[PDB]
Design a binder for this molecule. Sequence first.
Ligand code: TTP
Ligand code: TTP
Ligand code: GDP
Ligand code: GDP
Ligand code: ADN
Ligand code: ADN
Ligand code: CL
Ligand code: MG
Ligand code: MG
Lengths: 617, 617
Amino acid sequence: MKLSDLISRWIDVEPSKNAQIILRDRYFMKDLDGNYLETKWEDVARRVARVVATAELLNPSYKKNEKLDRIKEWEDIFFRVLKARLFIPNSPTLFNAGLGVKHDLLWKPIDQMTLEDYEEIYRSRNHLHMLSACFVVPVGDSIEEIFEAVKEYALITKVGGGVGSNFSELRPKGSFVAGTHGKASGPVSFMHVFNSAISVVKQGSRRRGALMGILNINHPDIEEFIDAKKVLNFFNLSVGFPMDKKEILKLYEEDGELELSHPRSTIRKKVKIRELFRKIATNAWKSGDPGLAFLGEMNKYYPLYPHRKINSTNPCGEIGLSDYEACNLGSIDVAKFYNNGFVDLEALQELVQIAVRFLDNVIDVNVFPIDKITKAVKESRRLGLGIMGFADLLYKLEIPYNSQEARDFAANLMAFIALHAHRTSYELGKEKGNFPLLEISRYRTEDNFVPFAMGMSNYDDEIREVMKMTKEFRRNVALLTIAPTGSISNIADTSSGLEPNFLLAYTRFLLYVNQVLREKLNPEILKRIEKELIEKGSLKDIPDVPEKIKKVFVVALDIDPMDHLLMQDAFQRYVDNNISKTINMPQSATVDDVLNVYLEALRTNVRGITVYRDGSL
Amino acid sequence: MKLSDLISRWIDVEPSKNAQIILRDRYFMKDLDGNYLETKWEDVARRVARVVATAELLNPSYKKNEKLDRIKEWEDIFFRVLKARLFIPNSPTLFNAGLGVKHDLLWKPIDQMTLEDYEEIYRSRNHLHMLSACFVVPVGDSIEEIFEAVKEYALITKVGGGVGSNFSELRPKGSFVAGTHGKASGPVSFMHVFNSAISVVKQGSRRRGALMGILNINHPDIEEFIDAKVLNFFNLSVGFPMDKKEILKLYEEDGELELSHPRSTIRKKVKIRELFRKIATNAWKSGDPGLAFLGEMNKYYPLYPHRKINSTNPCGEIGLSDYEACNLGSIDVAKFYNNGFVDLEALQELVQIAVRFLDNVIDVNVFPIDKITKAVKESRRLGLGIMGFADLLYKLEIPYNSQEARDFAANLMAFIALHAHRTSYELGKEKGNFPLLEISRYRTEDNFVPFAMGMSNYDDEIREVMKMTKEFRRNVALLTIAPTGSISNIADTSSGLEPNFLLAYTRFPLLYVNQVLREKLNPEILKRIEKELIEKGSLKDIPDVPEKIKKVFVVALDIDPMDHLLMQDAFQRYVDNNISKTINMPQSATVDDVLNVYLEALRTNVRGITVYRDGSL
Ligand SMILES: Cc1cn([C@H]2C[C@H](O)[C@@H](COP(=O)(O)OP(=O)(O)OP(=O)(O)O)O2)c(=O)[nH]c1=O
Ligand SMILES: Cc1cn([C@H]2C[C@H](O)[C@@H](COP(=O)(O)OP(=O)(O)OP(=O)(O)O)O2)c(=O)[nH]c1=O
Ligand SMILES: Nc1nc2c(ncn2[C@@H]2O[C@H](COP(=O)(O)OP(=O)(O)O)[C@@H](O)[C@H]2O)c(=O)[nH]1
Ligand SMILES: Nc1nc2c(ncn2[C@@H]2O[C@H](COP(=O)(O)OP(=O)(O)O)[C@@H](O)[C@H]2O)c(=O)[nH]1
Ligand SMILES: Nc1ncnc2c1ncn2[C@@H]1O[C@H](CO)[C@@H](O)[C@H]1O
Ligand SMILES: Nc1ncnc2c1ncn2[C@@H]1O[C@H](CO)[C@@H](O)[C@H]1O
Ligand SMILES: [Cl-]
Ligand SMILES: [Mg+2]
Ligand SMILES: [Mg+2]
């Protein structure tokens, strides 16, 4: 089907009452006095579409004679996709698009727009006009650098960004400080100061701070870091693995020792890698932190490595970012692409093309609080196009999430999306110009570079061809991710990212009940079991429910840890950034079960791991 | 007698074993390996003398044919007075003098010094070469300014400075934040972040952070601030930017104060008497917060209103404009006792030397922040003070708690003020005026004097000297009395203007007895009463101790609060900066007694108040 007709199917489907509450609470724009300027999702769609379309003012392929018509066309397509909720950008684009701009320009009819209206929108974007969710900054090994980084954290938090750092540059606790002849406090002590700062800074009531803190496995304070969370409430924590996954796996299998050391310290120590892993697994089993960040694996696929280097991810791990780099995200609701037993790839390809252009335009109208960030982003133009609604799409296709069928399906879907996204980046490089660093990247200096593992789709050869093409034209260093979509999946009334539904019937702080199950399950057998379902949190052992329904409508805890993990692998094979995935584990899971997840993760193509044991906290 | 004669009596007297412990612990310089580069006080005196004498390189009055000669002469004189411990600069001068300089230059014999050697010292002072104890920085009402100030606190603390701020620009808790449509955390919440930052920064083993936080009496969060003590690195003082007379009048009338802020809409009225009682109650319990009479400080500030004092450093003794710093040094007046009188001949010569020393410190000082370098160069504020005052009173057989002592104090301080300012005149003539002389009240007024006077017959001469400095003046202000918490130990003498807290106690088991008490008391009686003296902490109730001994050898708690306060007044009349003075109060004091001290303070010439009730903490 043509995308335009899929749009018609969804564009007048109104957000649920639950979605509308979320929108009214945090998304609808207000004036200084607190009056609503927006009252409907339609309003947000218009504002956002208009602001993002204005980036086309910079399009060198457009003559000044045609710019108005072209800009209006893009605003129109952006608006319709947004209103239909087929694609939604990360929350900050929704919150902040249009800040600074006159209120009589943001929602005026598109056919009344002039070239001057668009130029005024473009010129009037203020210093708060921050549209990207993901940031990384360095934390250098000096008081000057540390406290500058604290300030950066505050500035980023204020405008609504999530920020991460690798703290491994900071010399270990007890290390000599030549300036004062003193002893260093160590990275963990400094992280507490970052936490205290973020306790008093936020984007009002819209968005509290969200941080990632990584410390590398061979840092002498790694043991303290692993135990740090039991304070650091604004931090997610992961252990960094800068080395090859295969090197760490080999060390483990051979029961080897890791040398803990630091370039600006005499503090040295040998520890058994098995013991370190058991310590991590033990803490993860207890409380869910810390995760694992396979930085070496991120750099293996980073087109600018080794001249640039990924040392950290943003808060939910989905983007590996070089120093001062930021990234803007957006997600396609693939559940809306279900049609008569299949995914409408005709419509999907069209949307992928539009989505990549949209996200790339966001860069041009984005305003950052720090010049080094503005520059890093301009030079690389990293994007994070993902999906949401995947679990619900499987429901409609009658495919159990915990099956090889679903994983083969996932790989082919993500391969298809990657193919067309990268083809779009080629076309965009040709039209608007290549990202400034193309020439020094592996797309250029190397033959056969591909920014992911592939290996589970028939699209592989076509993907290889397109990667070769991007030696000459490429708008973006990387294009894909899968995010948690913690908010935007709720606005879209669909399942979150690649995650299975956590529950088929529940209440959040009200009542949510899976729309796809409503449509499949007979209302008789539904009214019955309803209570039992909300109490057991699964269909698994509710008697008198068709075996067919039970197998399809699985929830997170119905799906064993390895099936969670292998699904992450299927997607990561066709994602050039990373992926947010929780490996849910049953309350009855052991520390050794966690260790087994880690070892299996080391053999798969995943770039990081987060585990959460039911009943943990 | 001539100063040279007094130097001879003291120069070969080595510091007590007690002092040597302190020196070895944190004053003696070490190499990167931790080996001592200094092992005797005279080594410190050599290094410090040589570094500060190096400033004479910049003296425009010297011909190059004499520059070596002059520099050597000043190094020699500085060395002699330091070694003799007649005058000692603030700790950071002793800690940091010479950092960056090749070790073969700091201690070699002065007869081996060439002009090139001094130029080399001057060139190689590094970024840690910070020689001043007292700082103030502003904290502006924005996230950017707040966290820039946090960084400034860290940098200052690293090099061993003490820093204060007035936090009143920060809008009250709950105030609107336009950029986020949020609510402000308020100053007290942000002070916690400053405290957390300073918990992980220090000048090695030498000294931890030391901070002052002030909030003005009319700030809407004043009541929360008053109860704020989590803030362990802060001393707190309530700021009074209005005239002392105005607040006394409001108190006497049982009037109300309007609490308001420029960046907030909510105003509140409170009884000034209720506010004062809240302050007195907390100070009675815990010793905080103090009172800072900012308006009284600006009354005597030569640059007001062009420049403005909003805060003091940690112990309150210097009122500083934004980004201003000040270096201190104190003369041990106990060593000037001679046959029933103070030796004014020798003391005058030393005041002249110490003022030149302190002014030279500025030329070889390195600050961490450019705005501080600029503010210091423009004003050249100094803080020359005294220590050993209590022991001098002992030798003179004058009870600290008497009008006699207070009259003596005023006369002594007037003499010092007179000759310090005379020296600043001469220095202005020789080296050049401080750049802001022209816009100062020494120039723009008739009859400006930077203190109240009124208790000395030196007043007329002081008036004449201030008039002369209309034409020449090296320094905006010259005088303070500091706690001397460390340098009075090094000099083996009483601290600042404070009475001795105790006459005898046990060091580590070593019995210490005040040296003067030992010389005046019959050794037999001493051995007899020692036990009871340590137990009771005073001679007053000990039987068979001569009445005259009891009256003369008073300690802090023998002296009533009003007698502490009036001594502070006597000094403050002839000090152009402020004074560190603890108003000790007996454990049996009431909150009403504290209130009465506050009210008497408003009637006196004191510029601030700190009280401490014995046994409260
Ligand atoms: C000064 C100081 C540093 N540190 C830590 C912070 C950094 O991680 C590390 C270095 O701080 P720096 O500010 O670089 O100290 P320095 O440059 O004077 O000493 P060096 O030449 O040895 O680098 O030490 C503390 O933990 N506490 C302190 O007081
Ligand atoms: C952003 C933010 C500010 N503040 C406080 C810090 C400052 O005291 C005060 C101003 O912060 P600013 O950073 O100056 O906020 P703003 O410029 O976006 O808004 P405005 O025009 O109203 O100034 O608000 C918070 O307490 N929490 C926050 O999250
Ligand atoms: N500052 C801040 N950033 C967040 C928060 N939630 C998410 N982010 C950022 O947004 C990224 C994507 O999260 P996602 O759940 O997909 O956000 P959504 O766009 O709001 O649905 C995260 O990795 C963070 O970088 C938050 O509560 N605060
Ligand atoms: N950072 C820091 N500053 C201090 C400390 N003690 C004193 N200061 C600063 O030095 C000033 C004078 O204090 P004083 O006791 O006379 O210092 P001394 O030279 O060490 O004897 C104080 O007002 C503070 O500004 C400390 O422990 N740490
Ligand atoms: N170290 C971490 N701790 C908690 N959540 C993490 C971590 N790293 C990535 N995440 C992601 O953040 C989200 C937490 O709700 C999930 O998507 C999860 O996969
Ligand atoms: N608010 C305050 N102002 C000045 N000194 C204080 C204050 N609080 C405690 N003190 C202590 O009192 C002495 C100086 O008055 C120093 O020891 C200092 O640390
Ligand atoms: Cl009482
Ligand atoms: Mg350094
Ligand atoms: Mg502001």
